[PDB]
Write a protein that binds this ligand. Structure first.
Ligand SMILES: Nc1nc2c(ncn2[C@@H]2O[C@H](COP(=O)(O)OP(=O)(O)O)[C@@H](O)[C@H]2O)c(=O)[nH]1
Ligand SMILES: [Cl-]
Ligand SMILES: [Mg+2]
Length: 168
């Protein structure tokens, strides 16, 4: 509805890390504590301002589990950014970041902007993934890095703003 650029940005990451609530927090300012596996593929949109011009962010979301049906290059097609999300309270979701990176190399453009997102920062007292460690990891792998909380809203706007500005 009037925009200068449409930037496709995808969300990826293990089931349960907060992808769907990052989407809902960013596009509708809504959060649900309930947990429910995402159905098929969804996308939602939000427009923001960058360098005086209007950026329509089209943000895709899908299930992190790829057992019976796996994500294809069509999911990633034309994506200029990826929010690769893990749960700072569940170490396994961070261990699996390498698998997501492999999936991005196989299925996404070699120059996509990748933001590593440590979500659930409000669970800092349950932290399983030290901030400094993830930050260095992002550094070595050519990713941006931010910790967010969809629940209390911390850094959610900043994460999307930053990636869309990096892309711009
Ligand atoms: N404490 C906390 N819980 C979160 C946060 N984001 C998502 N959740 C919860 O984690 C569960 C999985 O969230 P969901 O958005 O469905 O993650 P997805 O499985 O990666 O799409 C739900 O119970 C959410 O309410 C967060 O920032 N903090
Ligand atoms: Cl599946
Ligand atoms: Mg989901």
């Amino acid at each position: 509805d009037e925009y200068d650029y449409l930037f496709k940005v995808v969300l990826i990451g293990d089931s349960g890390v907060g992808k769907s609530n990052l989407l809902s927090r960013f596009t509708r300012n809504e959060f649900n504590l309930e947990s429910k596996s995402t159905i098929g593929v969804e996308f939602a949109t939000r427009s923001i301002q960058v360098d005086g011009k209007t950026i329509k962010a089209q943000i895709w979301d899908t299930a992190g589990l790829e057992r019976y049906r796996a994500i294809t290059s069509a999911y990633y097609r034309g994506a200029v950014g990826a929010l690769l999300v893990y749960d700072i309270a569940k170490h396994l979701t961070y261990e699996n970041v390498e698998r997501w990176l492999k999936e991005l190399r196989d299925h996404a453009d070699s120059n996509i902007v990748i933001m590593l997102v440590g979500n659930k920062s409000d669970l800092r007292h349950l932290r399983a993934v030290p901030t400094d460690e993830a930050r260095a990891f992002a550094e070595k792998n050519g990713l941006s890095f931010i910790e967010t909380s969809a629940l209390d809203s911390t850094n959610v706007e900043a994460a999307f703003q930053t990636i869309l500005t990096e892309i711009y």
